[PDB]
Symmetry: none
Subunit: 292 residues, 4 copies
């Protein structure tokens, strides 16, 4: 029993136009070949799918049930092919990495240069993290490795975790080219504050010391790049990850404007669920565990 998918396309076209020669024209085949292909499909399915003796063409009951069967099969084929489009383009050494945007922009570039040129050289497919379903996508195999921040669920079994680094959220403000912060915590009035979502990881970090500082929330966002840009535009102060403002701190575009008690520790991890990955995935995991 062998069903050829373009027979399913043949039958669906014939179902909508109800004429053998016109359906043959729509599918760029001659009428005898289209008729023979419909007959081959009928032989494989084991039923007369079409009443060939009446014009316009009518569907048999079996034809009517196999019409929905064929539509389902066609759509399933199309979906399955779309699911592997990206992966197939990159090859057998593709590694699906879900990652937080700042984590990705910080970590992937240095990983990319440590790869050797051989037959199992990984090819990265990095997608921004889905905050709500990252754990479920990790279990289901939608991605091989997750670059995320400290999470009490992903850090524990049945998942494997690896601490990449522990840094700090630093409260920063912009400077004049003389190099001096435009905002401070020394005044009596609150300072314009560019905040994270209070329920996000970094927002939960800032809430610990919120009572130690007078802040006026003027802008909220989950994207640390957004808070960084708004700090650079003199709009306010923000707690930014140290790894995101290294050039800005080496230059004098930005400055830490707090005491050491305001600098808040954060950690980020690589997470996985499969006990054994393909060779490229294991190489990516190994390189992540030893980010020099």
């Amino acid at each position: 029993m062998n069903v050829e998918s373009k027979w399913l396309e043949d039958f669906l076209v014939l179902a909508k136009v109800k004429n053998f020669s016109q359906a043959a024209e729509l599918r760029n085949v001659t009428q005898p070949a289209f008729s023979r292909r419909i007959r081959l499909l009928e032989d494989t399915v084991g039923a007369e799918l079409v009443d060939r003796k009446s014009k316009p063409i009518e569907l048999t009951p079996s034809g009517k049930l196999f019409r929905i069967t064929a539509r389902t099969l066609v759509n399933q084929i199309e979906a399955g092919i779309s699911q592997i489009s990206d992966l197939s383009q990159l090859g057998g050494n593709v590694v699906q990495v879900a990652a937080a945007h700042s984590l990705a922009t910080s970590l992937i570039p240095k990983m990319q240069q440590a790869f050797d040129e051989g037959d199992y050289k990984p090819i990265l497919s990095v997608e921004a993290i889905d905050v709500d379903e990252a754990t479920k996508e990790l279990r289901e195999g939608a991605c091989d490795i997750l670059l995320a921040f400290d999470d009490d669920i992903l850090r524990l079994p049945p998942y494997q975790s690896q601490l990449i680094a522990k840094t700090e959220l630093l409260p920063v403000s912009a400077c004049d080219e003389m190099g001096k912060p435009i905002y401070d915590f020394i005044s009596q009035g609150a300072v314009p504050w560019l905040t994270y979502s209070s329920t996000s990881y970094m927002g939960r970090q800032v809430e610990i010391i919120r009572e130690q500082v007078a802040l006026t929330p003027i802008f909220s966002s989950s994207m640390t790049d957004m808070l960084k840009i708004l700090v650079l535009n003199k709009q306010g102060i923000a707690w930014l990850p140290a790894y995101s403002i290294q050039e800005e701190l080496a230059q004098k575009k930005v400055a830490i404007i707090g005491e050491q008690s305001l600098r808040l520790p954060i950690e980020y991890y690589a997470y996985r669920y499969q006990a054994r990955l393909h060779p490229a995935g294991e190489k990516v995991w190994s390189i992540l565990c030893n980010l020099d």
Copy 2:
């Protein structure tokens, strides 16, 4: 793009066992032929599906996802062909009717008696109704005619409806020796009650007059025949459709016990979705519309 399902079976076998020779022998094909069929599948889907650099042979990421796709496709093809195998054995005059058990056993016998001989004498295929999916089957063409009770969606467009009949749910109890009902409502206290599912149509009917009579529920079922059998076994009282207890009422086996306020009206219908059915189908529908 033309995918042949036997390639999907080849790939599933090659994914379970894990080298080409054993999978080829399991598929009753030559080794070069099996290799060519796997490579044809890969060329059609546009993805390397197996990494041939490792024994045992493992799936590429694309291969891992497409294995799920192939399993789904093969199972769907087999299901469609078996569903068609049942239907094709019956002639092109098969009419697929989904019916509630009570209505099937009450209406299909006389319907069968009304079938004259001819080129389009209907052959009935009567299946037990599942209202959660019978409406979808009606829309997709899996069944032609639905024999069901009053439904606010099926009675309206885009569906066509015909009121077959209007009868009454009669609260009945088994009779004693030669006449009188064993249970009654004027008598003292609540009575043993054989009830329908409170979500079902007939149960929703009984809930209208629930507050008028003292009942203690002792048995629940969605099948009128179950309640009727348990009534005949002198277990309690039940509201039964009038058409299911005709002989048992003519004979002194059962009796109605309530006041006329307790007899609850019910209606049942034939429903369809296709504006034009095959001759056997329109014949069955016509016979249903004139069941009088």
Copy 3:
């Protein structure tokens, strides 16, 4: 902390009509009392959900999101109450039994009488089986005990199975008033055949001996009672389970017309998934395992 669902409905009505007094009238509550209920809801969720200083009443952003939250919670409450409606009406000793129609009508009355020898009678809720999802329904807990026929999946772990009885499908025909097979197999000519679906269990059993007999299918049904009725109406022959035609065989209205090799064995089982049921469930299971 403690949200009261009546506050959720208060807020939904207020969001529709955008007026406190009208929303209070719709809620059968005093106007100051309704304002106080909304204020308590706002104090519990920790945000002003409504701007009270404007006509018409506008929703704050927090009110906009909590409208979705309240609709979700209210619909979830209604679903959770409807899911336990039937179970609550019958009590904590309710036993949810999914069963094949014939098996339920044959077995449940005898079980029901067994409840009377040995005091305290458990309460049954018997619903017809859906073999397509009965396995999943048993896993999820939608039913406690399944009464079904021999199934290669349900008979094995992780499910517990008990064979209730082994019976035969008997090929039977209607008999004249004197008593004689109207149809038979001695004629070299075909017989009107009332069949199951060939993919169903009993149909798959008839398929084993199909080649030994000359049959022409004139009617198909998944309901044994349907085939039995059409047999009694002298419409054709059918393979019926012996437990469903014992009185008809005894009253000689129906008769076995096949060779002993045409009588096909079938088995029916009680299945379960939970290792421990509630006491009533274990009692019903014990009585099913005995039924001897």
Copy 4:
């Protein structure tokens, strides 16, 4: 009917430990009050949820299903109040904008600069977009305005759309110390290609001219910032939006390669669903409409 969520907490704790003394103290309540709250939940649902006649405590069937219902309700309550926790800290002039990362970083700063002082000065809450549920966010009221690219669903009714701008995806390569592009299309061999997801909008744009250039995909990302960084790190060429590489183009860092036909047009939009937003939302929308 009034269900108090603290009763659901009572029931969940009681289910987890099955000890009344321990559950009552785990809820910091006196024992009689805890039992009364359990009984109030049972009277409100109209079902005995726990069986105290047995010890260790176990649930009635109704209680077993209502445990899942209670867990669901509690998690939804906590999640909705957490969703409101971020908004309530902000004022009633908060505008919830979902946006693609690059569009947010490109458009939100100038919008922030346009905000004059007044009673309804907007406070932006910008969250990264997930388009497959973006439309649901807009419809239900969780999102006021959507900053996304051309979408055939969001551009039409029932949504309001506004074209912000039309730009180009430019194929760009990093260039050396002298100022010559490291990669070009007059080179030997295919060039290393940093690509988008083939299903994404921008990847769907690149598929247009795929065959006009020899490309080898060595990296895939849904984030333009990632492709931009890897281009700047001399890893390959990429199609980048003009608005994201303006400084790099003006400076030496990056150069446009290829013929004029390789530049692909892209459009981005502001979408909304509510016909009338709060004054701050309408201000944000007007500013978006006048960004030109």
